[PDB]
Design a protein around this ligand. Sequence first.
Ligand SMILES: O=C(Cc1ccc(F)cc1F)Nc1cccnc1
Ligand SMILES: O=C(Cc1ccc(F)cc1F)Nc1cccnc1
Length: 186
Amino acid sequence: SMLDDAKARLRKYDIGGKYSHLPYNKYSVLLPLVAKEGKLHLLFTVRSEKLRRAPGEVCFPGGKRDPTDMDDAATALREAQEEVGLRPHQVEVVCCLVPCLIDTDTLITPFVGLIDHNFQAQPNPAEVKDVFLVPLAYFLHPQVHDQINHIFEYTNPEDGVTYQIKGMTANLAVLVAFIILEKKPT
Ligand SMILES: O=C(Cc1ccc(F)cc1F)Nc1cccnc1
Ligand SMILES: O=C(Cc1ccc(F)cc1F)Nc1cccnc1
């Protein structure tokens, strides 16, 4: 099946807890996969304009590890719940992808999660201005704009709204699309 095939592909790239004890400032993100209309999608947030870091930017749910978290996956799930109302029973964490090093002292660990089909996002407006889906296949043929760094522009056909996706968030989206969609019979 589509979902069994996606999880099987993802597991091959799982680094697990290999880098998780290193003494960094630690953040986790959840890359949330949603199956709709017979295709996989990624769920993104638009950060509230109120926030200190990166107001109004597109990013995956996530945040800084805190002492309550049993592990890095728990960080991702806790933050996703706070930001978009995703409950732990509504997500199956499939793997941990390559972590992202930033600022010399920070490690961001991405987890891919399969999201229940009955989840409906409840954006927490103190943190999130918007939540939207992009089909995973978009990231194989994105609409690229150079600002010199590459920015993806995605227009939602349901409403005509255009979102800009860039940086780590864009990079991770492409990685997940490659992992799941490469080398597939039609
Ligand atoms: O903050 C994140 C994830 C993240 C992205 C880059 C980063 F460097 C660290 C991180 F935790 N996600 C979020 C937070 C608040 C509202 N909507 C999304
Ligand atoms: O789908 C959306 C936003 C949206 C809803 C209708 C629409 F017409 C356009 C849109 F961008 N959000 C979401 C939330 C939870 C799970 N899966 C998708």
